[PDB]
Amino acid sequence: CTSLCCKQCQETEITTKNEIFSLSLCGPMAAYVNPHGYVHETLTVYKASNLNLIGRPSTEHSWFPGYAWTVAQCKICASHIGWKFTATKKDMSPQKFWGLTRSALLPTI
Amino acid sequence: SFVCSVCGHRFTTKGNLKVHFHRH
Ligand SMILES: O=C1CC[C@H](N2C(=O)c3ccc(O)cc3C2=O)C(=O)N1
Ligand SMILES: [Zn+2]
Ligand SMILES: [Zn+2]
Numbered sequence A: 001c002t003s004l005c006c007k008q009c010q011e012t013e014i015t016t017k018n019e020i021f022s023l024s025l026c027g028p029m030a031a032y033v034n035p036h037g038y039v040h041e042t043l044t045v046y047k048a049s050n051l052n053l054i055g056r057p058s059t060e061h062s063w064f065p066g067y068a069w070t071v072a073q074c075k076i077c078a079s080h081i082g083w084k085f086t087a088t089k090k091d092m093s094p095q096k097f098w099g100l101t102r103s104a105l106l107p108t109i
Numbered sequence B: 001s002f003v004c005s006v007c008g009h010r011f012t013t014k015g016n017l018k019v020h021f022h023r024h
Helices: B014-022
Strands: A003-006 A013-016 A029-033 A039-045 A051-058 A067-074 A080-087 A096-101
Touching: A013 A096, A039 A080, A051 A080, A067 A096
Parallel strands: none
Antiparallel strands: A003 A013, A029 A039, A039 A096, A051 A067, A067 A080, A080 A096
């Protein structure tokens, strides 16, 4: 449809293409390496739906300086979808966004 | 105390981490 969905669910809608934006100058979906070497092509979107947040936000290893991250999973199947990023300072724009990992989404980008 | 190397999800028990990790 209009939306990007949880690949495991196939049909649980997570965001819409209208929510994609460029935060990093590398673009709206760039490759990021986590502290264990795993590469996440991370699509940045303003808003997301049907996600559960796991745990407390953390700034350790954050790919977006000034933002903390919280693991986000599909609320229907519990598959990892990405992370919610929340600003640590009130003057930052946007104050929050979501980074969705490419392999967790359908259709295949 | 136990952390998924793929996504950063934290777990109190090693057994939940293992089930979670192999779901990736
Ligand atoms: O902005 C982000 C989001 C979280 C992500 N991350 C992970 O995927 C990860 C896995 C195991 C850890 O101990 C720590 C992290 C971590 O910070 C990362 O590197 N950067
Ligand atoms: Zn799902
Ligand atoms: Zn994980």
